[PDB]
Write a protein that binds this ligand. Structure first.
Ligand SMILES: [Mg+2]
Ligand SMILES: [Zn+2]
Lengths: 34, 228, 49, 62, 570, 712, 75, 217
RNA sequence: UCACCCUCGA
């Protein structure tokens, strides 16, 4: 709903019926880790 | 600002039908006056026509009239096509009575004072041997088209409009700098009451009054022209 | 070809090809496949020159 | 040999055509396409290509 | 016959022409200043450009060029913007859409090239597919939808003719179609309402004409009564003057047959103008048709849950039977495939049974404008079973329609078949193209040389308990041939004589007389030394008349065979 | 994040079969099955999934939830493809006891074989961490993805990343949760590295003061050209004195709006065929989108030219250009370089450059001048850089490197100057628009705001999408997007007096009421269900006049803006997200009457950049022959392409208004004959009955007319 | 040729009537082409035999001549 | 059949309903649309032709200290509603120094021209921000895109802007149909920007349509 | 301009 893990992010109310137990990792980690 | 040279020309197909071209118009105004001119030509021109008819001997069974081959439906169809001009505001009745085997024409009708039948050579019905036809007609003025509105008298569909069929189209004819200007083509087919020229002129006068209604509102600045 | 003659193998090839093309609902007039088949039989081999 | 060389397996065609010392008549369509000649079909046929056009004397008077 | 040509493209393409005509007029003193004037784009050029373009055709091409109709000549009209404007009827020929397609323009220069463009390659000159003779350039999908809505009949619509009851007259008859138009301007007369009109300028059907008139003659202004809709009247107005009144709901098949007859009998220019008028009216009434999509217009089948419960009960029986080792693994998968095929078909049947005939989805599918009912079944009903990467069917189907939305698993399973087909088509088009190239090579030497082989050889086609059973191949094999031996039957007469066109009337009259087989000339048995003869090849598909002499029918045959190659599947 | 199967050490391109490209069952949660090229690279390039990470060994692992005693814990275990097949994995969509357990008897699961089946809840080892686990970034941004087929979903995912940035970015009214995260991880957005308060905000930079007391400043990328020409501007979204936490977005990038990915605009769409101008996938636009710069985009392009050392001497970048008017040079500075801020047109000089002429090609009438007037010092020619055809804009910047100064330049290159030119492209006919659901199209016509069908209150629709394109293509997510977009535009208030209606009871938490133009998200496979959208369609808030313009069917009454009569049936209208893809007529239009040729085969060059001609290929010649048009085929193949003496003859004849001459011989045929002779093949062109024919021409044919033009 | 709407530009004159004066479409091509470049030779050799338009392309004049049978031809 | 009449109702200062009646049956829609199309298209007004900022020679750059770039400043300047009695090219000026917000009220219009929304945001300035802008105002109709510097005699500093001349905001209509005696009552609804009042715009379009329909005679 | 390779468009 709030997606408050990111500060100042606009409030986009979510129709989601399921909780997210894990958060999206660093989308660039495939490069930076390497 | 100012926009000029909107000329109007006419191509004559027949005496009762013509095409008009208004060109050239700005990229607007091609469809603003396109549908309005047609609807004005159709509904806003005054003209007289038949409203109701009564024929003896056919009262209770409207299916057939003895002595003539045509049904009552075909009689009403032929009668609705009659063009007539009446000067009397109140309804005026005419009569058509013809006996003996033969063919009845619109000239065989006796027009009361003030009304005029414009197509005498029109066909109505054919009388069998020892046949006779007596029919009352009701003629009055009106506008546009209206469906069927003393027992033994039936209402018909009244075609008051002196114009029969109007269709319009818009095409581009602008300068090479623009190549987008509209141009109006109007195909108009009218009855013998008036030529398409006079029908277009009456529509123009009525619409000039209509819009003029608005102009009176402020009587202010608007797009100028050169030729009228 | 060798058993029934050249006039019959053309019919065979035309109807087989047109049948495969008709299996997928394709309208190809036979004269085209005939134009193609006609080219296939224009030479003769030589046993004893 | 030109058509066959342009179609497929150019090396083998050219080898065999060099051995047999072949001479292309320049007859088929694709050959005229290659050499830039008017193709022998449609408007390029001698029947249509060489048509003579002259005004009739009746119209030549007018 | 027209194409929209951007101003910049036309100025650059005609640059020497506009320079010459711009030196003719004194805009430029010499030719170098004329070139500089066309390069600076000074306004004087544009009025000159419109002159140099007039009646100078151009060639439009879209790759890949599958048949000769992939290149067509047009008269260029100067158009504002940088995009090429293409006539909507020539799409089917080019297989051209407007999802981002591009086309190329070539300017013929020599007098002979311009003549070939105006005569041979003109857009309005090629209306028929040279492969099948059918006519492309027929109203495609949107246009049809409009026509289908314009000529369809609505029982109980506004203004519907009703018989006289008591003192109430009929009120369903109109003296002329103009009166019907005036009544339609008011809310009185619906366009799709069944009425009676006196038609002065239209020819009636053969039956009404033969009864009311003589067979030989009907004339303009001769009135006759018809029970139709005003829409069908306005449609028949689009058709040429002499064509009889149709009075049918216009499916794409029916208007296809109409254009077929018009091309078979009437000249070409009439057919072109007729399909143009059909285009205009189809687009107008497609705008007015009220065809739209919404989540409500997509109707889920009402008993789908119960159907799926029953068929999965069957499948659970099959799996319990497999758990005892009775059923074979491959037999198990085959049984499940059959079960879920049947379930898919049943759900689709229920769907069609629940869908009212006026729904926009059903109207779109069944009018023949676009789509097939299997897309309606996957959309609203059910997806069914999906392909394996190996190609097999997966024993579990996708029970969710795309309206309900697939689950994660169903979507992932669908991707298999989706990408499998996307990849397969890339190789299939290459195979078709290679085969087409080989056909072109082997057949390009085949052109018509003389008029008649004069040989009496030919081939036999069927065309057919004591009742007529029509042969499905008549159009592909029997039709369009030339008769080598005139048709003879028991108690025979002159029915079709040797060398006749063998068109639709000839075929019909042949079949009616009791003919069951015919022997016609063909290219197979043609006796020409080099090439083929016109009479043995038959009529040209694109022209309809006898094939000309210069025609290179080998390339036409190669293209005709290889064009629908990408449609052949396993 | 792409994964490519081609390259050194992997399989070659000719080794790529259909079976390596297909979606493998082990790609679940590792490689996205939707996002992949449409062309020859299909199945060879694939995007990494969202939750997947690369093993130290080089494997791809995907997270799962450990299920102990039929309960689902928060313990996440990453599994490779090897470890996964030993276990049976549940699905992300699953019924769960408040404590955590499966309420359904048998759930659907991915088998070790990967085949789907049914199994009880005590045998489930792991469960998906989330839906979209299998989906990439670009694909997970498609709302109602589960309502689209993999073909159009693929096209939508691939078309999102083809969208240009717009002068201002408008976040989508209806989206996913991926816009924010994808934007901030993409790297084109400015983020606060440490919590603090903004000390200063300018268009040039943003300086923040941490609670540490340490300053940190971020410079704004302003009108920087990207690799593909799309402009990448950066704009601050914070004001002076705002307190920002670490990780907050300080300034937006090109396609970001307040931190979220905004690849297009929210447009008012009507779904109906309109007079055939939207026929066969075309698109009708409201002229507003021009006047209000809604789809306007900035396109920067870089021009480069260098003066170097030739055999005759060194080139010079100078304003001194021989035989050139002062008027055309007016926009150039003393250096010969164009001045910043000037507007350039096709053919305008960007950089003046002269090159020493060898005098071997010097004109006889010019050698008259050089010999009579004694020209000694400067014999040069105009090699100056000009603007390419169809390209125009405002010179933004100029950078220059000189050998006279200390700069690294390649050998022989004296000076090197780059001129940047930006153009503001409005939306126009031919430009390519597309939604997130794979619905593409070009603009057939842009009608004036009056011609556009308008709602009851006079609001004209912005874009008219043809109806026939929706049902067959199996992308109905666009329709649900339209419905929810109207619901988000007008806002809604679900009635809750004895409320909690059974449809709104399941998902909506505080989605009960929403103010107009709210932003909502439909996560893929967890988006709003159909019942909830149908419910929202009813409680749509009215407009300012109290009218409910869109009924509970999502449709509305529209008035034909041309005649004035209302359209007879209600049409679906709503708000759809439309992107301007990077394919524009300004880029794609090309025309060539005559141009440069390749020196080997003498055929016209190819490509718009090289001012090339269109290739009339083999199949096009097949078509031309099938027509039987011989002269057209000869003209295309001889005097238009390869006839060296016929090209200039034709141009001269048309210029002087004469007939077109007879074609000659294609020069590439001479090249073919020479190539065969180089292969030890003796090729000879024979006469009718004669021997070999000489194929070249004498040089004395050209002298008569030259000596005559000089007045012999 | 009965009733039909008046042709516009290129399609004038209609090809059905022009093909009535020639055996084949290709022969008509060569017909009009040679007549057209003949007319253009006249401007720099006989004709035009009909009234030329405002600015008429020579091929169009040639076609309008072939329509009125104002010239003969031989294959 | 009485002569048609035109009455006015008022909702706000810039919005007015109008009622025309009686009209022929089915005629109201066509009149409402013929007037609406004219209102949006061809109501004359005044707008800014081209601007000029001191420190910038072209549109794609940033003035120091100001928060918005020149393009964002131009798009904010697009919202300006202005009126001019000159019907000739005139010049407004703006000189502002931060730290403060620049608004439309900070512009100094010359005699004859008037800025109708001073509360509009233009740009935001800080301690170092200094903004000096000339704004050329002209009077025209419809929508004219920026006049390029090649067409006019403009110099490099000139930044032409797109000018939206139409004072009208939103127009709609609805008709009441009445069915022996049938007639239509047309209801126009006009809303304008504060440049002019709906009566003025409707009168301008009425005169335009009178001048155009005078061709029929 | 020549040759590769890459990523795209129908
Ligand atoms: Mg396409
Ligand atoms: Zn033969």
């Amino acid at each position: 709903s709030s997606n408050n893990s990111v500060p100042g992010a606009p409030n986009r109310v979510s129709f989601a019926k399921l909780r997210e137990p894990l958060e999206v990792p660093g989308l660039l980690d495939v490069q930076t880790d390497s | 600002l100012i926009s000029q040279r909107p000329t109007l020309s006419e191509d004559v197909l027949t005496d009762n039908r013509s095409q008009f071209v208004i060109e050239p118009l700005e990229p607007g105004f091609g469809y603003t006056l396109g549908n309005s001119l047609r609807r004005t030509l159709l509904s806003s021109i005054p003209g007289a026509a038949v409203t109701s008819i009564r024929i003896d001997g056919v009262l209770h069974e409207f299916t057939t009239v003895p002595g003539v081959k045509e049904d009552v439906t075909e009689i009403i169809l032929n009668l609705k096509s009659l063009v007539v001009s009446s000067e009397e505001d109140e309804p005026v009745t005419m009569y058509l009575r013809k006996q003996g085997p033969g063919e009845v024409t619109a000239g065989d009708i006796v027009p009361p004072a003030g009304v005029t039948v414009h197509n005498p050579g029109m066909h109505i019905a054919t009388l069998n041997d020892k046949g006779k036809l007596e029919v009352e007609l009701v003629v009055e003025r009106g506008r546009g088209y209206v469906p069927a509105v003393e027992i033994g008298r039936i209402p018909v569909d009244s075609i008051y409009s002196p114009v029969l069929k109007v269709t319009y189209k818009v095409d581009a004819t602008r300068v090479e700098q623009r190549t987008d200007f509209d141009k109006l083509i109007l195909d108009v087919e009218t009855k013998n009451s008036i030529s398409p020229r006079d029908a277009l002129a009456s529509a123009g006068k009525t619409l000039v009054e209509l819009f003029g209604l608005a102009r009176e509102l402020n009587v202010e600045a608007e797009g100028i022209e050169i030729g009228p | 070809l060798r058993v029934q003659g050249p006039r019959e193998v053309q019919i065979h090839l035309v109807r087989e090809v047109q049948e495969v093309y008709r299996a997928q609902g394709v309208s190809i007039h036979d004269k085209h496949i005939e134009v193609i088949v006609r080219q296939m039989l224009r030479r003769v081999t030589i046993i004893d020159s | 040999w030109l058509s066959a060389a342009s179609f497929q397996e150019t090396t083998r065609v050219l080898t065999d055509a060099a051995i047999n010392c072949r001479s292309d008549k320049l007859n088929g369509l694709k050959e005229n396409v290659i050499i830039g000649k008017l193709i022998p079909a449609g408007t390029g046929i001698n029947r249509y290509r060489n048509i003579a056009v002259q005004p009739t004397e009746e119209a030549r008077a007018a | 016959h027209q194409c929209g040509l951007p101003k910049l493209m036309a100025l650059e393409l005609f640059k020497p022409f506009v320079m010459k005509r711009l030196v003719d007029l004194n805009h430029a003193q010499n030719i170098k200043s004329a070139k500089r004037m066309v390069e600076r784009q000074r306004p004087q050029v544009w009025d000159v450009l419109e002159e140099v373009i007039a009646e100078h055709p151009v060639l439009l091409n879209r790759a890949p060029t599958l048949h000769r109709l992939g290149i067509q000549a047009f008269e260029p009209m100067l158009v504002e913007g940088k995009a090429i404007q293409l006539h909507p009827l020539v799409c089917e020929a080019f297989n051209a859409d407007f999802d981002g397609d591009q086309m190329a323009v070539h300017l013929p220069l020599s007098a002979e090239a311009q003549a070939e463009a105006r005569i041979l390659m003109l857009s309005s000159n090629n209306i028929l597919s040279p492969a099948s003779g059918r006519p492309l350039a027929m109203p495609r999908l949107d246009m049809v939808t409009g026509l289908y809505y314009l000529t369809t009949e609505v029982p109980g619509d506004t203004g519907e003719y009703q018989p006289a009851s008591g003192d109430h007259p009929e009120t369903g008859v109109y003296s002329s179609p103009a009166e019907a138009i005036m009544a339609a301007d008011r809310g009185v007369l619906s366009v799709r309402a069944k009425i009676k009109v006196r038609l002065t300028q239209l020819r009636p059907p053969v039956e009404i004409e033969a009864e009311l008139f003589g067979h030989s003659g009907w004339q303009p202004g001769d009135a006759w009564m018809a029970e139709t809709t005003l829409g069908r009247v306005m449609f028949n107005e689009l058709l040429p003057l002499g064509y009889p009144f149709v009075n049918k709901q216009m499916h794409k098949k029916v208007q296809a047959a109409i254009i077929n007859d018009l091309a078979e009998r009437y000249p070409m220019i009439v057919v072109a103008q007729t399909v143009d008028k059909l285009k205009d009216a189809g687009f107008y009434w497609a705008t007015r048709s009220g065809v739209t999509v919404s989540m409500a217009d997509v109707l889920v089948p009402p008993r789908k849950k119960e159907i799926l419960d029953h068929y999965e009960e069957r499948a659970d029986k099959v799996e319990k039977q497999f758990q005892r080792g009775a059923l074979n693994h491959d037999e198990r998968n085959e049984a499940l495939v059959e079960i879920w095929k049947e379930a898919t078909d049943e759900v689709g049947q229920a769907l069609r049974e629940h869908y009212p005939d006026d729904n926009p989805i059903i109207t779109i599918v069944d009018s023949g404008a676009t789509g097939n009912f299997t897309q309606t079944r996957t959309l609203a009903g059910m997806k069914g079973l999906v392909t394996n990467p190996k190609g097999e069917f997966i024993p579990r189907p996708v029970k969710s329609s795309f309206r309900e939305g697939l689950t994660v698993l169903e979507y992932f399973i669908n991707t298999h078949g989706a990408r499998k087909g996307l990849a397969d088509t890339a190789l299939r088009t290459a195979d078709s193209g290679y085969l087409t190239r080989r056909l072109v090579d082997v057949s390009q030497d085949v052109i018509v040389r003389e008029h008649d082989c004069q040989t009496e050889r030919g081939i036999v086609v069927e065309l057919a308990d004591g009742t007529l059973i029509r042969d499905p191949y008549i159009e592909t094999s029997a039709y369009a041939r030339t008769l080598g031996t005139d048709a003879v039957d028991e108690a025979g007469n002159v029915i079709v004589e040797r060398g006749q066109d063998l068109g639709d009337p000839e075929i019909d009259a042949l079949l009616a007389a009791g003919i069951t087989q015919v022997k016609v000339r063909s290219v197979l048995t043609c006796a020409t030394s080099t090439g083929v003869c016109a009479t043995c090849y038959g009529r040209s598909m694109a022209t309809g008349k006898l094939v000309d002499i210069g025609e290179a029918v080998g390339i036409v045959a190669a293209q005709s065979i290889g064009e629908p190659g990408t449609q052949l599947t396993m | 994040r792409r994964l490519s199967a081609l390259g050194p050490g992997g399989l070659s391109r000719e080794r790529a079969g259909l079976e390596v490209r297909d979606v493998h069952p082990s790609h679940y949660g590792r490689m996205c099955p939707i996002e992949t090229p449409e062309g020859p690279n299909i199945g060879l390039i694939g995007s990494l999934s969202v939750y997947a990470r690369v093993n130290p060994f080089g494997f791809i692992e995907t997270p799962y939830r450990k299920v102990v005693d039929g309960v689902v814990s928060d313990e996440i275990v990453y599994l490779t493809a090897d470890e996964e097949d030993r276990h049976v994995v549940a699905q992300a969509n699953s019924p769960i006891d408040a404590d955590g357990r499966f309420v359904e008897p048998r759930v659907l699961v991915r088998r070790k074989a990967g085949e789907v089946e049914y199994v009880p809840s005590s045998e489930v080892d792991y469960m998906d961490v989330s839906p979209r686990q299998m989906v990439s970034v670009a694909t997970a941004m498609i709302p109602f993805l589960e309502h689209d087929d993999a073909n159009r979903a693929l096209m939508g995912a691939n078309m999102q990343r083809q969208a240009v940035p717009l002068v201002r970015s408008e976040a989508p009214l209806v989206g996913t949760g991926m816009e924010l995260r994808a934007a901030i991880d993409a790297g084109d957005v400015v983020v606060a590295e440490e919590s603090g308060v903004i000390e200063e905000v300018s268009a040039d930079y943003i300086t923040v003061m941490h609670d540490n007391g340490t300053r940190r400043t971020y410079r704004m990328r302003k009108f920087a050209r990207s690799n593909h020409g799309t402009c990448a501007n950066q704009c601050p979204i914070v004001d002076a004195g705002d307190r920002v936490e670490a990780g907050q977005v300080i300034a937006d990038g090109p396609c970001t709006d307040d931190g979220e990915m905004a690849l297009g605009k929210n447009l008012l769409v009507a779904i109906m065929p309109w007079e055939g101008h939207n026929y066969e996938d075309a698109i009708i636009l409201s002229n507003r989108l021009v006047e209000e710069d809604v789809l306007t985009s900035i396109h920067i392009e870089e021009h480069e030219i260098d003066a170097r050392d030739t055999k005759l001497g060194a080139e010079e970048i100078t304003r001194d250009i021989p035989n050139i008017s002062d008027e055309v040079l007016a926009d150039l500075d003393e250096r010969g370089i164009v001045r910043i801020g000037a507007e350039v047109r096709d053919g305008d000089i960007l950089v003046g450059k002269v090159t020493p002429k060898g005098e071997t090609e010097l004109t006889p009438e010019e050698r008259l001048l050089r010999a009579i007037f004694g020209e000694k010092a400067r014999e040069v020619r105009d090699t100056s850089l000009k603007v390419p055809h169809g390209e125009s804009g405002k010179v933004i910047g100029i950078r220059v490197f000189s050998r006279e100064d200390e700069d690294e330049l390649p050998a022989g290159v004296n000076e090197l100057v780059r001129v940047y030119v930006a153009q503001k492209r409005k939306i126009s006919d031919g430009d390519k628009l597309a939604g997130r659901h794979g619905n593409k199209g070009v603009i057939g016509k842009i009608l004036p705001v009056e011609d556009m069908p308008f709602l009851a209150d006079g609001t004209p629709v912005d874009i008219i999408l043809n109806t026939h394109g929706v049902p067959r293509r199996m992308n109905i997510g666009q329709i649900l997007e339209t419905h929810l977009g109207w619901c988000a535009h007008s806002g809604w208030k679900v009635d809750a007096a004895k409320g909690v209606p059974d449809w709104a009871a399941r998902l909506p938490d505080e989605l009960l009421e929403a103010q107009p133009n709210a932003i909502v998200s439909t996560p893929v496979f967890d988006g709003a269900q159909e019942a909830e959208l149908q419910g929202l369609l009813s409680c749509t808030l009215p407009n300012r006049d109290g009218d409910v313009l869109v009924d509970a069917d999502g449709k509305a009454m529209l008035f034909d803006g041309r005649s004035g009569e209302p359209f007879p049936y209600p049409v679906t209208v709503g708000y759809m997200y439309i992107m301007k893809l990077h394919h524009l007529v300004d880029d794609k239009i090309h025309a060539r009457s005559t141009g440069p040729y390749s020196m080997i085969t003498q055929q016209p060059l190819g490509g718009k950049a090289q001012f090339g001609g269109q290739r009339f290929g083999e199949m096009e010649c097949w078509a031309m022959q099938a027509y039987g048009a011989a002269y057209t085929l000869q003209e295309l193949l001889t005097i238009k392409s390869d006839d060296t003496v016929g090209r200039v003859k034709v141009y001269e004849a048309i210029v002087k208004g004469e007939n077109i001459p007879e074609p000659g011989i294609p020069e590439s045929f001479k090249v073919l004959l020479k190539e065969l002779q180089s292969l030890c093949l003796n090729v000879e062109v024979l006469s009718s009955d004669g021997a070999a024919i000489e194929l070249r021409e004498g040089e004395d044919e050209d002298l008569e007319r030259a000596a005559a033009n000089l007045g012999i | 040729s009965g009733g039909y709407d008046t042709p516009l530009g290129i399609t004038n004159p209609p090809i059905d009537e022009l093909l009535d004066r020639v055996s084949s479409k290709y022969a008509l091509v060569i017909y009009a082409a040679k007549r057209a470049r003949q007319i253009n030779d006249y401007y720099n050799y006989v004709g035009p035999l009909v009234e030329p338009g405002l600015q008429e392309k020579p091929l169009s004049i040639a076609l309008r001549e072939i329509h009125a049978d104002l010239l003969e031809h031989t294959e």
